[PDB]
Amino acid sequence: SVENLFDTYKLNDTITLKNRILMAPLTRCMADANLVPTDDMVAYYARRAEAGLIISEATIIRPDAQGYPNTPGIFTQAQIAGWRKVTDAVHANGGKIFVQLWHTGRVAHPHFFGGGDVLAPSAQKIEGSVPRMRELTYVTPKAVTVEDIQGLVRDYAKAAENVIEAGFDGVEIHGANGYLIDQFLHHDSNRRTDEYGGTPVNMSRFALEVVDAIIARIGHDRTGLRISPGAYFNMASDSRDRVVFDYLLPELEKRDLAFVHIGIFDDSIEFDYLGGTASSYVRAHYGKTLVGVGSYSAETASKAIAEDKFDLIAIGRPFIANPDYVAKVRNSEELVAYSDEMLASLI
Ligand SMILES: Cc1cc2c(cc1C)N(C[C@H](O)[C@H](O)[C@H](O)COP(=O)(O)O)c1[nH]c(=O)[nH]c(=O)c1N2
Numbered sequence: 116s117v118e119n120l121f122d123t124y125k126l127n128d129t130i131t132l133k134n135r136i137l138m139a140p141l142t143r144c145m146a147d148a149n150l151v152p153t154d155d156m157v158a159y160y161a162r163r164a165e166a167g168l169i170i171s172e173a174t175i176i177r178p179d180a181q182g183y184p185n186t187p188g189i190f191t192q193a194q195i196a197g198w199r200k201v202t203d204a205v206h207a208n209g210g211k212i213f214v215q216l217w218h219t220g221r222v223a224h225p226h227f228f229g230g231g232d233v234l235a236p237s238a239q240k241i242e243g244s245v246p247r248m249r250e251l252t253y254v255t256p257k258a259v260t261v262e263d264i265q266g267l268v269r270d271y272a273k274a275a276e277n278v279i280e281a282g283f284d285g286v287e288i289h290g291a292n293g294y295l296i297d298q299f300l301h302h303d304s305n306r307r308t309d310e311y312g313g314t315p316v317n318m319s320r321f322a323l324e325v326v327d328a329i330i331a332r333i334g335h336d337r338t339g340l341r342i343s344p345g346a347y348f349n350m351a352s353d354s355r356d357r358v359v360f361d362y363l364l365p366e367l368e369k370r371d372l373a374f375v376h377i378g379i380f381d382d383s384i385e386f387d388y389l390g391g392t393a394s395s396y397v398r399a400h401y402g403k404t405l406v407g408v409g410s411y412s413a414e415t416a417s418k419a420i421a422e423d424k425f426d427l428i429a430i431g432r433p434f435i436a437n438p439d440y441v442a443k444v445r446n447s448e449e450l451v452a453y454s455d456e457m458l459a460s461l462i
């Protein structure tokens with residue numbers, strides 16, 4: 116029995132979720148040429164509104180954040196209007212939705228933004244090329260200056276303001292999966308020797324500045340953060356990364372965020388450097404609402420939550436394969452297994 120998945124969950128004084136099931140953020144690359152959410156996207160999100168909370172696909176804060184085709188933005192008025200259709204539809208269907216705010220850092224590609232500079236903490240290129248594209252090899256980033264950083268913080272904050280204009284319930288800051296914020300938090304990507312590198316406090320500085328700027332614009336109750344203490348996507352591991360997160364997590368707790376959310380694909384994986392699974396590491400160092408994710412069935416998620424491993428469960432691939440995931444779980448119906456083939460279709 117997975118009855119606990121359908122508990123009401125009070126995130127905070129502003130937001131109460133009707134159940135513990137979140138739709139995980141899932142890039143689909145289906146926005147229009149202007150990076151505006153389409154009416155097909157509106158329908159896609161609207162039909163998943165039985166989720167306690169939807170986290171949107173990663174949404175770029177400005178043009179030089181783009182690293183994949185057709186990923187929506189929220190920096191133009193047209194994008195705001197397109198997103199307003201999405202949020203209105205979700206709300207009309209009895210749901211709630213946060214936008215996931217994205218900058219890809221060294222994983223951006225200049226093909227998407229007129230040949231400009233790719234930005235990152237340090238000039239450390241990742242291997243390979245953009246997936247599902249013809250020969251877009253990743254490039255050596257420019258190490259951002261402190262002035263670049265100030266502009267990036269500003270643009271995260273402005274994006275957050277725009278999110279509220281677009282009618283979202285809040286923001287999940289994308290601090291995970293090897294993208295810009297995560298790049299500051301790991302030694303592979305952050306080789307800086309200024310106030311944004313070297314020490315745990317310094318490496319955490321960018322993440323905390325973005326969090327604080329966004330809170331100052333839209334409020335802590337409407338601000339969550341996704342993190343990846345375990346390196347796994349476009350990120351080489353480093354035994355020293357753990358102490359950065361040892362510092363970051365208590366600092367994050369001071370901000371009384373709506374939630375912290377793990378970024379991983381299979382949370383049953385144990386990380387040597389974390390002394391166990393990603394969620395268990397975070398749970399041991401962070402005492403507020405935690406969203407678990409990664410290869411959980413409704414059954415294993417229910418048990419984890421019962422055992423106080425985390426509080427909310429994000430579901431990704433099964434929500435792609437089953438738009439009616441929540442109803443099927445509620446009624447013990449057969450779930451279709453996800454296959455990569457399903458990404459071609461937006462249903
Ligand atoms: C096609 C696709 C696209 C995305 C993802 C995954 C997949 C499959 N994931 C990761 C996702 O949120 C989740 O962490 C994983 O899918 C693992 O959870 P499940 O096992 O699928 O429930 C992801 N994560 C994120 O923070 N922002 C994103 O935009 C995406 N994009």
Ligand SMILES: CCCCCCCCCCCCCCCCCC
Binds near residue numbers: 142
């Ligand atoms: C990101 C959207 C969909 C991507 C499909 C490809 C898979 C990306 C995630 C990889 C998961 C396993 C990575 C290997 C980890 C090594 C270190 C633990």
